[PDB]
Design an enzyme around this catalytic site. Structure first.
Site, PDB file in Angstrom:
ATOM      1  N   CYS A 149       0.726  -1.438  -0.144  1.00 26.73           N
ATOM      2  CA  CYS A 149      -0.267  -0.389  -0.152  1.00 26.73           C
ATOM      3  C   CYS A 149       0.921   1.473  -0.070  1.00 26.73           C
ATOM      4  N   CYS A 154      -2.002   1.554  -2.385  1.00 28.18           N
ATOM      5  CA  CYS A 154      -3.467   2.738  -1.966  1.00 28.18           C
ATOM      6  C   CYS A 154      -2.727   3.832  -1.932  1.00 28.18           C
ATOM      7  N   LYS A 157      -1.333   5.123  -5.849  1.00 24.18           N
ATOM      8  CA  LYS A 157      -2.451   4.903  -6.898  1.00 24.18           C
ATOM      9  C   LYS A 157      -3.746   6.315  -6.168  1.00 24.18           C
ATOM     10  N   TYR A 291     -10.357  -3.551  -9.319  1.00 23.29           N
ATOM     11  CA  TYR A 291     -10.136  -2.590  -8.634  1.00 23.29           C
ATOM     12  C   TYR A 291      -9.191  -1.449  -8.588  1.00 23.29           C
ATOM     13  N   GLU A 295      -8.901   1.236 -11.499  1.00 20.33           N
ATOM     14  CA  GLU A 295      -8.708   2.700 -10.792  1.00 20.33           C
ATOM     15  C   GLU A 295      -7.409   2.966 -11.451  1.00 20.33           C
ATOM     16  N   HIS A 566     -26.379  19.881   5.338  1.00 19.09           N
ATOM     17  CA  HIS A 566     -26.764  20.527   3.989  1.00 19.09           C
ATOM     18  C   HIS A 566     -25.485  21.990   4.007  1.00 19.09           C
ATOM     19  N   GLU A 571     -25.655  13.221   2.603  1.00 18.74           N
ATOM     20  CA  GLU A 571     -27.335  13.890   3.742  1.00 18.74           C
ATOM     21  C   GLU A 571     -28.244  12.937   2.466  1.00 18.74           C
TER      22      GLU A 571
HETATM   23  C1  FAD Z   1      -2.404  -1.432  -6.691  1.00 18.73           C
HETATM   24  C2  FAD Z   1      -3.336  -1.827  -5.252  1.00 18.73           C
HETATM   25  C3  FAD Z   1      -3.656  -0.554  -4.738  1.00 18.73           C
HETATM   26  C4  FAD Z   1      -4.519  -1.432  -3.590  1.00 18.73           C
HETATM   27  N1  FAD Z   1      -5.391   0.078  -3.419  1.00 18.73           N
HETATM   28  C5  FAD Z   1      -6.030  -0.503  -1.668  1.00 18.73           C
HETATM   29  C6  FAD Z   1      -6.586   1.189  -1.112  1.00 18.73           C
HETATM   30  O1  FAD Z   1      -7.061   1.764  -1.176  1.00 18.73           O
HETATM   31  N2  FAD Z   1      -6.797   0.752   0.327  1.00 18.73           N
HETATM   32  C7  FAD Z   1      -6.426  -0.321   0.936  1.00 18.73           C
HETATM   33  O2  FAD Z   1      -7.437  -0.532   2.279  1.00 18.73           O
HETATM   34  N3  FAD Z   1      -5.787  -1.597   0.810  1.00 18.73           N
HETATM   35  C8  FAD Z   1      -5.692  -1.301  -0.694  1.00 18.73           C
HETATM   36  N4  FAD Z   1      -4.931  -2.212  -1.159  1.00 18.73           N
HETATM   37  C9  FAD Z   1      -3.603  -3.536  -0.753  1.00 18.73           C
HETATM   38  C10 FAD Z   1      -3.386  -3.336  -0.023  1.00 18.73           C
HETATM   39  O3  FAD Z   1      -2.247  -2.603   0.069  1.00 18.73           O
HETATM   40  C11 FAD Z   1      -3.174  -4.677   1.067  1.00 18.73           C
HETATM   41  O4  FAD Z   1      -4.621  -4.780   1.544  1.00 18.73           O
HETATM   42  C12 FAD Z   1      -1.554  -4.064   2.089  1.00 18.73           C
HETATM   43  O5  FAD Z   1      -0.967  -4.036   1.623  1.00 18.73           O
HETATM   44  C13 FAD Z   1      -1.548  -5.472   2.592  1.00 18.73           C
HETATM   45  O6  FAD Z   1      -0.565  -5.284   3.652  1.00 18.73           O
HETATM   46  P1  FAD Z   1      -0.667  -6.850   4.431  1.00 18.73           P
HETATM   47  O7  FAD Z   1       0.661  -7.294   5.864  1.00 18.73           O
HETATM   48  O8  FAD Z   1      -1.100  -8.122   4.158  1.00 18.73           O
HETATM   49  O9  FAD Z   1       0.854  -7.154   3.125  1.00 18.73           O
HETATM   50  P2  FAD Z   1       1.849  -5.823   1.910  1.00 18.73           P
HETATM   51  O10 FAD Z   1       1.450  -4.741   2.207  1.00 18.73           O
HETATM   52  O11 FAD Z   1       1.712  -6.806   0.785  1.00 18.73           O
HETATM   53  O12 FAD Z   1       3.190  -6.361   3.118  1.00 18.73           O
HETATM   54  C14 FAD Z   1       4.278  -7.309   2.801  1.00 18.73           C
HETATM   55  C15 FAD Z   1       6.016  -7.243   3.014  1.00 18.73           C
HETATM   56  O13 FAD Z   1       6.744  -8.448   3.124  1.00 18.73           O
HETATM   57  C16 FAD Z   1       7.690  -8.667   2.249  1.00 18.73           C
HETATM   58  N5  FAD Z   1       7.925 -10.141   1.719  1.00 18.73           N
HETATM   59  C17 FAD Z   1       7.422 -10.748   1.356  1.00 18.73           C
HETATM   60  N6  FAD Z   1       7.813 -11.810   1.484  1.00 18.73           N
HETATM   61  C18 FAD Z   1       9.445 -11.384   1.797  1.00 18.73           C
HETATM   62  C19 FAD Z   1       9.733 -12.415   3.002  1.00 18.73           C
HETATM   63  N7  FAD Z   1      10.153 -13.889   2.755  1.00 18.73           N
HETATM   64  N8  FAD Z   1      11.109 -12.349   3.790  1.00 18.73           N
HETATM   65  C20 FAD Z   1      10.694 -11.311   3.515  1.00 18.73           C
HETATM   66  N9  FAD Z   1       9.638  -9.446   3.232  1.00 18.73           N
HETATM   67  C21 FAD Z   1       9.065 -10.491   2.622  1.00 18.73           C
HETATM   68  C22 FAD Z   1       7.205  -8.201   0.962  1.00 18.73           C
HETATM   69  O14 FAD Z   1       7.948  -7.804  -0.459  1.00 18.73           O
HETATM   70  C23 FAD Z   1       6.287  -6.889   1.789  1.00 18.73           C
HETATM   71  O15 FAD Z   1       6.918  -5.725   1.742  1.00 18.73           O
HETATM   72  C24 FAD Z   1      -4.081  -1.767  -2.657  1.00 18.73           C
HETATM   73  C25 FAD Z   1      -3.534  -3.000  -3.109  1.00 18.73           C
HETATM   74  C26 FAD Z   1      -2.566  -3.017  -4.689  1.00 18.73           C
HETATM   75  C27 FAD Z   1      -2.009  -3.819  -4.757  1.00 18.73           C
HETATM   76  C1  FAD Z   2     -25.923  32.913   4.360  1.00 20.43           C
HETATM   77  C2  FAD Z   2     -26.581  31.544   5.195  1.00 20.43           C
HETATM   78  C3  FAD Z   2     -25.808  30.573   4.981  1.00 20.43           C
HETATM   79  C4  FAD Z   2     -26.679  29.806   5.333  1.00 20.43           C
HETATM   80  N1  FAD Z   2     -25.685  27.913   5.320  1.00 20.43           N
HETATM   81  C5  FAD Z   2     -26.766  26.857   5.874  1.00 20.43           C
HETATM   82  C6  FAD Z   2     -26.129  25.752   5.379  1.00 20.43           C
HETATM   83  O1  FAD Z   2     -24.747  25.701   4.720  1.00 20.43           O
HETATM   84  N2  FAD Z   2     -26.533  24.518   6.179  1.00 20.43           N
HETATM   85  C7  FAD Z   2     -27.405  24.131   6.485  1.00 20.43           C
HETATM   86  O2  FAD Z   2     -28.531  23.787   7.023  1.00 20.43           O
HETATM   87  N3  FAD Z   2     -28.460  25.721   6.904  1.00 20.43           N
HETATM   88  C8  FAD Z   2     -27.463  27.164   6.014  1.00 20.43           C
HETATM   89  N4  FAD Z   2     -28.556  28.050   6.699  1.00 20.43           N
HETATM   90  C9  FAD Z   2     -29.717  28.262   7.429  1.00 20.43           C
HETATM   91  C10 FAD Z   2     -31.279  27.630   6.187  1.00 20.43           C
HETATM   92  O3  FAD Z   2     -30.775  28.946   5.572  1.00 20.43           O
HETATM   93  C11 FAD Z   2     -32.284  28.145   7.085  1.00 20.43           C
HETATM   94  O4  FAD Z   2     -32.310  27.594   8.553  1.00 20.43           O
HETATM   95  C12 FAD Z   2     -33.080  27.845   5.740  1.00 20.43           C
HETATM   96  O5  FAD Z   2     -33.601  27.819   4.713  1.00 20.43           O
HETATM   97  C13 FAD Z   2     -34.602  28.613   7.052  1.00 20.43           C
HETATM   98  O6  FAD Z   2     -35.962  27.685   6.157  1.00 20.43           O
HETATM   99  P1  FAD Z   2     -36.979  28.544   6.838  1.00 20.43           P
HETATM  100  O7  FAD Z   2     -37.822  27.576   6.670  1.00 20.43           O
HETATM  101  O8  FAD Z   2     -36.862  28.733   8.421  1.00 20.43           O
HETATM  102  O9  FAD Z   2     -37.262  29.738   6.159  1.00 20.43           O
HETATM  103  P2  FAD Z   2     -36.206  30.401   4.624  1.00 20.43           P
HETATM  104  O10 FAD Z   2     -35.803  29.754   4.181  1.00 20.43           O
HETATM  105  O11 FAD Z   2     -36.186  31.937   5.357  1.00 20.43           O
HETATM  106  O12 FAD Z   2     -38.151  31.110   4.020  1.00 20.43           O
HETATM  107  C14 FAD Z   2     -39.421  32.243   5.151  1.00 20.43           C
HETATM  108  C15 FAD Z   2     -39.900  32.358   3.181  1.00 20.43           C
HETATM  109  O13 FAD Z   2     -41.167  33.074   3.822  1.00 20.43           O
HETATM  110  C16 FAD Z   2     -40.871  34.583   3.211  1.00 20.43           C
HETATM  111  N5  FAD Z   2     -41.801  35.227   4.051  1.00 20.43           N
HETATM  112  C17 FAD Z   2     -41.497  35.730   5.134  1.00 20.43           C
HETATM  113  N6  FAD Z   2     -42.628  36.460   5.620  1.00 20.43           N
HETATM  114  C18 FAD Z   2     -43.567  36.476   4.769  1.00 20.43           C
HETATM  115  C19 FAD Z   2     -44.706  36.287   5.204  1.00 20.43           C
HETATM  116  N7  FAD Z   2     -45.418  37.541   5.890  1.00 20.43           N
HETATM  117  N8  FAD Z   2     -45.791  36.417   3.943  1.00 20.43           N
HETATM  118  C20 FAD Z   2     -45.310  35.829   2.566  1.00 20.43           C
HETATM  119  N9  FAD Z   2     -43.753  35.242   2.905  1.00 20.43           N
HETATM  120  C21 FAD Z   2     -43.383  35.278   3.901  1.00 20.43           C
HETATM  121  C22 FAD Z   2     -39.436  34.564   3.169  1.00 20.43           C
HETATM  122  O14 FAD Z   2     -39.227  36.076   2.713  1.00 20.43           O
HETATM  123  C23 FAD Z   2     -39.282  33.460   2.792  1.00 20.43           C
HETATM  124  O15 FAD Z   2     -38.600  33.441   1.506  1.00 20.43           O
HETATM  125  C24 FAD Z   2     -27.856  29.273   6.294  1.00 20.43           C
HETATM  126  C25 FAD Z   2     -28.241  30.898   6.232  1.00 20.43           C
HETATM  127  C26 FAD Z   2     -27.589  31.940   6.320  1.00 20.43           C
HETATM  128  C27 FAD Z   2     -28.489  32.958   6.004  1.00 20.43           C
END
Ligand code: FAD
Ligand code: FAD
Ligand code: FXH
Ligand code: FXH
Ligand code: CA
Ligand code: CA
Lengths: 588, 588
Positions: A149, A154, A157, A291, A295, A566, A571
């Site tokens: 890895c 890993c 990659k 995979y 990849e 959100h 979500e």
């Molecule tokens: C292209 C590729 C991509 C991968 N991507 C992921 C990923 O994204 N996420 C994930 O979780 N897993 C991934 N894997 C799998 C991951 O690499 C293995 O599951 C993990 O490295 C295996 O760990 P290990 O301890 O079993 O053996 P290894 O990591 O292979 O270590 C074994 C070591 O022992 C050495 N050895 C062998 N024989 C001897 C010996 N007689 N004496 C001394 N040393 C020896 C070997 O040369 C090696 O250095 C990927 C594998 C590959 C091939």
């Molecule tokens: C800059 C900013 C960033 C935010 N980022 C996030 C985020 O990333 N994730 C998250 O979960 N929340 C976020 N929020 C909060 C989110 O916007 C609010 O929690 C959500 O929009 C409120 O929903 P609501 O139904 O209570 O009211 P609102 O979405 O405000 O809707 C109320 C509506 O009723 C209208 N209205 C008011 N009075 C009247 C009336 N008398 N008659 C008719 N219509 C009326 C209003 O003009 C409005 O259109 C953010 C808020 C702000 C200000």
């Protein structure tokens, strides 16, 4: 039951101290040991449901029932006063160092599992050696400490994936208002490989340092298990010697397979070679549909490459096939060509690799489709990703009695024990386990704790989440839809599902109704979530947290009760309502 | 208990059918209704723990105990034969349309909550009207249907965040091998705003279409509740009329506050204006320290802007303050300037906004620091983000009897009921609830189901996860560390924590030991996870899934048992081991 556990713990621990929190004489022992730089495990009996039953069975080992009690490699060493006695007379060092073996633990293999096991064991006083050797690939590629890895898996990659994703960040950047002349932008393979290799190098070094700092002996030597406790090692100089250890961990991993066709070993490469390749692959054929295959194809295409994937039968065998098809469709729509129902017959060389201008060679690939038409096409690079295999005849004398299975993998109990009772196997060579780096790490660390600190916790290999880092990433945890149906019957399975569109894709003018998620649930078990599947950006970040919930037995109602964050892709798992059986379309 | 539920359900549902799955005459009823395009709720009694007790209490309403039974607005309409009777005689339309009120539901406010409630209600036959009107900002800015998040909130905010993140993708692209001349790259505000506004426009349109397609009446009119069932509406033409509805949902949200200082209304802007601003803000001062303030400051800085944040006391009051400080430190290290312990006294105008070349004006901001030194500095744009408030005197005749609290928010029971029993409040005006779009949606949809489909499920407002989309994102679910300590005592709290480094940051040469995560756990409740906190990229994707597990009662051991996905940022939650009390450093 408690005596079994205590018998195993005492026999196995290198240096262990039984103790209680509310015990000054224990602290006196801990301090002398700390002062003396003597690492050890510690079990505070005042924090166990049955600590006081344990305190009693201990007298079957020590002839006393008080704390502290200190053991070394199976022998009661003494109470407080006998420890201090040994110290003051400076006999303690030779005492905690006495063993029939050179080491308490020899790890054969310096990869994900073996390094994690080794470090964790040294923590509790186990004198540890880690052996690692990297057999060169046919073209001579080798690498440093850390395993597949770190070096050829890993880590590189995912970094090359990232380089490909940045391609689409450059395209998106224009629609979000960035002015950049995209027709004078090109990618430089060798710059990328150099950055990747400099990071790997820092990991090779970081591991060597970690091992030194935990007093683990690192031997860059090929190990061969000749008897239960004896490892023969061959060094760089081809000098042979023998070391002995109490416990052995086999953690030697696997290497890429080649197809048995002319030209494959001579002119193709595998992932082992890809991530340090000194030339740009150029027009590339990937043979395989793992995979790994997808990849690699995917990032080469995003880097601007002319890329073809030769697929014998299906994509991602063993994965949910609806998801695999969606993964493949996204790739084909984004520049990956697929030679479907096709196998290779031979690779012929047309140009030798230019080792001094860093340019690829040139190859003619001949093959045939299932419909009988011939495949014949030129490629600069041919990459085999037709699976991986263990190399254990290179490590295991057949006389030691470690049972392997059909595929050459080690047959283990659920605590990683081989048929040789002091010999354990972790990682990819442990037959039947998910072949994943974090599995190997958790296995190795939890095993080390059982061996040398009296822990009992086993590694849970069920519902292990995965992510495939294809151009559109695919994360999954639990069963495929088809495996759930096969197991429980179609009438007992409900599938909730939806398309979705990342907010980031809107201004960027990317696809509606391509990203996709589904929960596969069991009707008769309270709509228990049996598998979760998501295709979309950051799919590994999306999936990870849900794996905790699935391990806890999450139901559909647990997802529904939870409030979304959100705006995120994740979500959408909290508001799924369309079922498959309803026939209603998942598009949004 | 069951009679209470049934009495409420029958009284409230617009058109509801009691039924069983194994009932042909019921299907005959469903078909006639489907055929006639008559929407309704349905409760299959053969799928309830107490469906057969329900079948009995029904005779207290119908004088019969068989299925099917069809009700309209509180009145038993008939068994199968009476339904068919009404149909064949084409009396069914006027029957299911008879009501004392114009509508079964009037929603005042066309935002996140109100639109979700309206659609869901129409699903079950509730004749629904949605009122929305957008009072212009002081400079005249207005927008279309969808509410704050769609138009001037979460949606444009996250898209402009994305435009800022792409800045760092451009920088990273070089280290991953992409050749691009970064000194001839600039950002164009107006191009970005145009793409953002075109997406919002598609949402405005998409909502109008959704409402038409669910037969909901959309009135772009300011609503005023004059009695429990009467809403007075003023249209664009200033024509006044009165509509009546059975249930009323108040979903009118909030608007930005201005500080009471000279020049603020005349020359500053709020988030309401920012996301459609026709000129680039230029050198900008953000007054405030809310998540709005920091998110806006952050993306303006990543877009290349000269940005300053004026902070009266602390960052992100009400959030975990260790995390808030780390959020602020990252920003200050990446180009956001902070005028700390500072408040504004007056804004003076130096240049009027050029409405015909789309350039900002110019402002002199005068203020003072706590140490008595004067603040005096020129800015092209001054943005106030000093909090938000409801506008209910504009909606609520005080004579109707809807109780508001100190801050003008609506005091509600845990089923969203105001002190006027047919009047409900959802979203930001519901006193004491998390002010978040997915909360508002879940509230409105679950309320609609209780009103018109006999559901009982309440919205769970506890442990609602959040994400702050600052340049380094911060996701959280559950308690801050300080709130846990205050609640349970310091001795009962254990905090596990670690730095981490995204793999993507390695080749890119970004910071070690800045991203950070922690789990705040309760020692005496099996190390129950009381709060989860993560600072890093994709923090909303990371956090979402864990919110399901936390709602299920996850412990530290549930995290540990779970296997990581590698390589991801989120997997670090599965291997946390350093506690705060241990004093050991979290760096890695
Ligand atoms: C292209 C590729 C991509 C991968 N991507 C992921 C990923 O994204 N996420 C994930 O979780 N897993 C991934 N894997 C799998 C991951 O690499 C293995 O599951 C993990 O490295 C295996 O760990 P290990 O301890 O079993 O053996 P290894 O990591 O292979 O270590 C074994 C070591 O022992 C050495 N050895 C062998 N024989 C001897 C010996 N007689 N004496 C001394 N040393 C020896 C070997 O040369 C090696 O250095 C990927 C594998 C590959 C091939
Ligand atoms: C800059 C900013 C960033 C935010 N980022 C996030 C985020 O990333 N994730 C998250 O979960 N929340 C976020 N929020 C909060 C989110 O916007 C609010 O929690 C959500 O929009 C409120 O929903 P609501 O139904 O209570 O009211 P609102 O979405 O405000 O809707 C109320 C509506 O009723 C209208 N209205 C008011 N009075 C009247 C009336 N008398 N008659 C008719 N219509 C009326 C209003 O003009 C409005 O259109 C953010 C808020 C702000 C200000
Ligand atoms: C053919 N079948 C529909 C599944 C499928 C795809 O959808 C896309 C690419 C593929 C490549 C090889 C095999 C199968 C593939
Ligand atoms: C001052 N204190 C350490 C917390 C803190 C930061 O770490 C960084 C920026 C800040 C801006 C305003 C107030 C407090 C801030
Ligand atoms: Ca939900
Ligand atoms: Ca784990």
């Amino acid at each position: 039951g408690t005596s079994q556990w205590l018998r195993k713990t005492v026999d196995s621990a290198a240096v262990i101290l039984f103790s209680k929190t509310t015990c000054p004489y224990c602290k006196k022992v801990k301090d002398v040991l700390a002062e003396a730089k003597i690492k050890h495990a510690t079990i505070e009996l005042d924090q166990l449901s049955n600590g006081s039953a344990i305190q009693k069975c201990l007298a079957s080992f020590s002839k006393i029932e008080t704390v502290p009690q200190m053991f070394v490699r199976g022998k009661f060493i003494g109470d407080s006063q006998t420890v201090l006695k040994y110290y003051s007379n400076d006999e303690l060092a030779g005492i905690v160092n006495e063993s029939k073996y050179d080491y308490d633990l020899i790890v054969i293999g310096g990869g994900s599992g073996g390094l994690a096991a080794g470090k964790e064991a040294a923590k509790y006083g186990a004198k540890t050696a880690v052996l690692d050797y990297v057999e060169p690939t046919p073209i001579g590629t080798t690498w440093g400490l850390g395993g597949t890895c770190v070096n050829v898996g890993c880590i590189p990659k995912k970094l090359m994936h990232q380089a490909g994703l940045l391609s689409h960040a450059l395209e998106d950047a224009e629609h979000f208002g960035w002015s950049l002349d995209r027709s004078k932008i090109s990618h430089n393979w060798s710059t990328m490989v150099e950055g990747v290799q400099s990071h790997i190098g820092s990991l090779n070094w970081g591991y060597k340092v970690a091992l030194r700092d935990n007093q683990v002996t690192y031997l860059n030597a090929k190990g061969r298990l000749i008897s239960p406790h004896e490892v023969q090692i061959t060094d760089k100089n081809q000098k042979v010697s023998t070391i002995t250890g109490n416990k052995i961990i086999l953690a030697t991993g696997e290497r890429p397979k080649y197809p048995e066709i002319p030209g494959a070993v001579e002119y193709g490469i595998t992932s082992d070679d890809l991530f340090s390749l000194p030339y740009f692959p150029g027009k590339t054929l990937v043979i395989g549909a793992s995979y790994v295959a997808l990849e690699c194809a995917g990032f080469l295409a995003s880097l601007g490459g002319d890329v073809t994937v030769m697929v014998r039968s299906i994509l991602l065998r063993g994965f949910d096939q609806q998801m695999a098809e969606k993964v493949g469709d996204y790739m084909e729509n984004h520049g990956v060509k697929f030679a479907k129902l096709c196998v290779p017959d031979e690779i012929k060389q047309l140009k030798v690799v230019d080792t001094e201008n860093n340019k690829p060679g040139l190859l003619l690939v001949k093959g045939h489709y299932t419909d009988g038409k011939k495949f014949e096409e030129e490629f600069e690079t041919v990459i085999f990703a037709v699976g991986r295999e263990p190399q254990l005849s290179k490590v295991l004398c057949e006389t030691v009695g470690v049972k392997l299975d059909k595929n050459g993998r080690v047959v283990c109990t659920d605590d990683e024990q081989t048929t040789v009772s002091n010999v354990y196997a972790i990682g990819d060579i442990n037959a039947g386990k998910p072949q994943l780096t974090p599995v190997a790490i958790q296995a190795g660390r939890y095993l080390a704790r059982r061996l040398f600190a009296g822990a009992t916790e086993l590694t849970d290999y069920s519902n292990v989440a995965t992510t495939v880092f294809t151009p559109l990433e695919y994360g999954a945890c639990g069963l495929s839809e088809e495996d759930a149906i096969e197991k429980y019957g179609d009438k007992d399975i409900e599938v909730y599902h939806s398309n979705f569109k990342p907010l980031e894709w809107t201004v960027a003018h990317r696809e509606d109704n391509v990203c996709y998620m589904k929960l596969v649930c069991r009707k008769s078990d309270n709509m228990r979530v049996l598998g979760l599947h998501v295709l979309g950006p950051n799919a590994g970040e999306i999936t990870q947290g849900y794996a905790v919930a699935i391990k806890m037995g999450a139901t559909k109602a647990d997802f529904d009760r939870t409030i979304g964050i959100h705006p995120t892709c994740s979500e959408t798992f909290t508001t799924l309502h369309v079922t498959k059986k309803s026939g209603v379309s998942p598009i949004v």
